[PDB]
Subunit: 341 residues, 4 copies
């Protein structure tokens, strides 16, 4: 039985807490957060063994097998490192690291300590995305993939820390792009990136990029687009399309639920938009990959099953983003080495 | 651990076998089928303890706690009765009975033997339908429901037995209407039916009805429509709409998955239509309510938790259908007693 | 050049005025309305020769070739009769008459005076509905039609007169049903109605029906449904579906425009809902059949071309509704003669 | 009455012939084509005054006021020049020119001869796109536009000439991009482009690009994407999305018609895909902008009304594409001058 501690009790701490609570092969042992009231809140919502106000004490506890790190991005590196060094397995919310060396160093460290290190690329475990990838891999029907596009848009992060280079490590390209990139590669069966191009925008007044377009050229000839935004109203969008020589497939997470509803007021449990026509959500957490992701990690820690999607894939997406940032600066298409095509 | 035997190893035996095999609180003990090779095959797909070629022996086994009956409708009454008399809990695939007296007799019987009797109204446990119901019950946003419509259409049953009055008990009105009716009433919080009206059609040449419309007048003033068909091409449809004084809720099961795909050929894993634009499916079993339904039954047997949706609800739908059949024959709107409004 | 006068300057007077103004083969000569300020308004918006405050004077004018009657339903009979007797051709907004004898009498009268009498069954001239009918008539692809359903729903008429039996002649069944029925028959190439069944509802507090379901059985075996409502929020709905032995076709007028838009505020020229996700409209008038309808009438008056869709079709739909009203009262399925099937 | 000659009697000659034949303010005088049987055939479909086998004779005819040039792109420059020099007004199908100097030279020329020169940017006159633009220009609802994306994809041109650099002038970027670019700029009220970035692909084996992405940075801060493909199956796509600080607008031409249909066979009048679920089309020519475009040109020639959208706009799009081609070659983001940002 896999004994889990959740580091950081904000939005994603809550998502992971729910999943763990529900997983028969695991137990929610601890909730930690710099703000101890937020940790208590959550230990209670999900019947965690305790709320741990102390980081040192959390790491020292020999009962905890696995930590899930859902703190701001700037902190991932330091805490994942500390947690591995304390002998705990770690799942870190994306971005696993704010730079490729940070990621490389964590992967290296996990090995030293013979630990499972996983990252929060949930959409790659989303049952509907998994299905989508099967269909593109159906060569008779689909042919050779030549285009993949992933769109991730919302009205921006609300936590202050996401506004700071020091705390967030990056703007919308890192927050959302990391996922879009990870998905583009995964959808094409781990395609090798040969070049990267990107432009960034600051749409909102004063600074981190709110909107970005990143484009990858892959070995097989295909091209991948990542279009992400902090600055799009009317509801979170997560979509993808893959186009081949013979087929197409299209995936829609938040408006592909099969539910529409209308009211003047707003419906009790329907985030946003509240009013008029909305697309209520059902099993959002499952649909998004979290149950499956966490289950994989739990099965990995519990019975040394290898991860289907490992932190090497985080290193690749980090290199892509780093190269994307540099491409924007220089106004050029670059190879992963930083060199101008 | 709830020890389960699956009676009838066709299509739905397989669906239920899967769900049981995955449920940590249950074990798939036996698979029975008049055709023993079909039972062997399924015991193997899903690692059942054994294939039981004998019905008497199955009933006599004190190891089996619960039977799931997935045989043709004509056989439900007799086998559920026999199984209850042998002291086994029973989940019967809908229609629970081919007439209201058949249903009544089974409910009575289960009480006599202090047994859990459940029926296969899966859509009522479908997470997206559950969500839909919450929204209609949100009186501030939705207001008073005045119209509910459920549509169930396909290109007709593939098994020969579905062509026979003795084996099927009925045509499309019983095969599909049962579900549509059950949903209408459940979506309106168990609304009482005061009248019923129906017309049936025989679209295909020679006989059981292959298309039907049934309309219910409810106590609170609302009207429910059930539109079902065996004779609709281009893919199974299951949709629902609820309309209130203030709101609307629309639900779409088979084309509310958020996946579209196109090929000339057809995609290896995609039932039908095969070619051109299709709407592939993800977790169809979960989406349809089966994991949740069966979980409720397993929790009901395992720790005497009352069923959220019991066989009383099957008696009501049976009365509605019986009344529907009679209404068509007489050309009139009827009360549940058979009397002409 | 066809010289036109528009009787009644409310909503539909405005629609017809626009169409006429734009038609190269016609001229907008006069606008009449009991309220002369409303007539002046409209003569001005669309550059009509004059506003005519007097009905007697309007009828007497030898310049006017054609009147378009867009007054409340109770008045159609009397004014169409007066206008025909004055030698003017007439297009009457639906319902052409509030009863079948009223319709029969007008058709008879038009003949006496050798006049073109047309009615406002615009959707039957809607280019997208026309296309839909071609596809159903494509026997190789579609097969034999066995089901047709037309849905017409909105949040109800806003003019007071629509609340009065004397002024409106009927509730939602007559206001909306007339169209739905007309469309069902037309979509199936003028199918003969063998029976009719209907239930009506009063959803809003005190009285005319706000919501109705009417069902037709046709000669060829097909069944038609008309589902109409004054009591549906979130935006006017006009949809249709036809299902055959081999095909299906689905038609969507107001959310089949290919435009979505989102705002908090509301967008200047986007009726309703105003706020959140909306489906703006483009060329609504054309899309709805009015340009084509009126053009047919103009071509009929201008160069004695026969009408593609005549006022005989209004007599049939009147008989259907009359029989629908009676069916509801008696609780039975009826033949067009009033006789109980 | 504006007397028109249609140069080139292929697909688009036919589209334009139809529109002209229907326009009360114009007459279809002549059809010319190097292939005189193709010209005869079209003169007949649409009741043209004559088929003109000779180009010199066509230009010399003082009866012809306006030529519509629907020949392959390579020929536009030479024939528009010759036609202007002969004193004829000209509408040239896009691309107006195969390079900016070609376009510039034509604009210059038309001024010299006091002639109306228009180009075939039809989507810019598409009523549904016009509507879309109003909505984005609704600053209260929409805010400041920061992203515009136009997608144009199909399975590639069917005429042989489109395979040749000399005859086509270019691949998919010029054939489709021209329209996508033109739309991006028009949707943002004629926005000034400050930089351009592009990658091209050759998906099909041996050469002209069959897929492209082009990205524009505009003066006001906004970013435009043009995604075009010759190598996308399952049906022509033409879509657009505009995103602002407060709103979004989405437009869909070919699957925003509100018609769906299904058959096994294929429906007699439904291009492609033929089989399974399709999206039949209604008034495709109107919906695409051609009636309105040609009407503007006819009103411009007939009564010297300035064009709402002139050939200056074609020079801008040409500069963008030229810059796009160069950007791909150099691997860099460029200014319109060719200089590296
Ligand atoms: N998978 C996804 O789709 C997704 C979605 C949103 C966010 N995220 C990622 O998840 C992580 C957390 O995001 P979130 O939106 O829940 O943020 P949040 O602001 O809602 O939660 C963060 C919490 O951590 C706390 N915290 C701050 N410093 C800390 C410290 N030193 N030790 C412990 N706790 C500390 C804060 O008080 C806050 O309660 C981020 O890395 C982000 O990139 C992922
Ligand atoms: N709720 C739903 O979603 C849903 C969907 C489909 C079917 N069903 C229901 O499930 C039931 C079975 O449907 P199916 O599609 O699986 O039929 P099927 O043809 O696939 O399977 C029937 C099986 O039962 C076996 N069988 C027949 N008579 C038997 C007997 N007397 N004893 C033991 N085994 C016997 C057959 O050999 C066959 O293997 C039906 O009652 C149907 O109404 C429900
Ligand atoms: N085709 C459609 O889809 C559609 C839609 C709405 C209404 N209609 C029909 O069109 C007709 C008019 O509907 P509307 O919504 O414009 O109503 P409206 O109330 O907007 O307009 C009616 C106008 O006629 C005037 N009027 C009243 N008595 C009159 C008289 N004796 N002489 C002249 N004018 C008089 C009123 O002052 C008002 O200005 C109705 O018959 C209705 O059934 C059709
Ligand atoms: N705006 C749009 O929506 C759109 C759509 C499709 C095509 N187009 C454009 O329209 C133009 C024609 O396209 P199409 O698809 O009709 O090509 P097509 O193959 O259908 O027609 C070309 C015709 O021109 C004739 N022709 C060739 N050379 C000629 C010459 N030198 N003089 C006279 N006639 C000649 C050919 O015999 C043929 O009949 C192209 O420039 C293309 O870019 C525009």
């Amino acid at each position: 039985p896999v004994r889990v501690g959740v580091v950081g009790a904000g939005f994603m701490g809550g998502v992971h807490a729910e999943v763990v609570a529900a997983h028969p092969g695991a137990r929610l042992e601890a909730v930690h957060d710099l703000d101890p009231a937020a940790a208590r809140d959550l230990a209670e919502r999900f019947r965690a063994e305790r709320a741990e106000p102390s980081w040192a004490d959390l790491l020292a506890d020999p009962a905890i097998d696995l930590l899930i790190i859902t703190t701001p991005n700037g902190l991932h590196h330091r805490q994942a490192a500390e947690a591995l060094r304390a002998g705990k397995h770690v799942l870190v919310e994306k971005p696993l690291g704010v730079t490729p060396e940070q990621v490389a160093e964590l992967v290296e460290l996990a090995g030293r300590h013979d630990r499972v290190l996983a990252h929060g690329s949930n959409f790659v475990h989303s049952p509907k995305f998994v299905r989508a990838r099967q269909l593109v891999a159906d060569t008779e029907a689909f042919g050779r993939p030549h285009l993949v596009r992933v769109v991730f848009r919302n009205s921006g992060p609300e936590a202050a820390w996401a506004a700071s280079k020091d705390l967030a490590g990056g703007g919308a390209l890192l927050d959302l792009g990391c996922h879009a990139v990870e998905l583009c590669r995964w959808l094409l069966d781990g395609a090798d990136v040969e070049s990267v191009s990107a432009r960034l925008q600051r749409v909102r007044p004063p600074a981190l990029e709110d909107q970005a377009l990143l484009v990858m050229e892959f070995a097989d000839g295909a091209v991948g687009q990542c279009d992400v935004s902090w600055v799009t109203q009317g509801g979170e969008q997560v979509t993808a399309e893959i186009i081949g020589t013979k087929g197409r497939v299209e995936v829609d997470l938040w408006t592909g639920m099969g539910l529409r509803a209308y009211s003047d007021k707003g419906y009790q449990d329907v985030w946003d938009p509240e009013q008029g026509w909305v697309h209520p959500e059902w099993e959002w957490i499952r649909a998004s990959g979290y149950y499956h992701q966490d289950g994989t990690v739990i099965e990995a820690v519990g019975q040394g099953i290898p991860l289907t999607h490992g932190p090497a894939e985080a290193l690749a997406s980090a290199r892509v983003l780093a190269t994307g940032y540099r491409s924007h600066a220089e106004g050029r298409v670059l190879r992963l080495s930083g060199a101008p095509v």
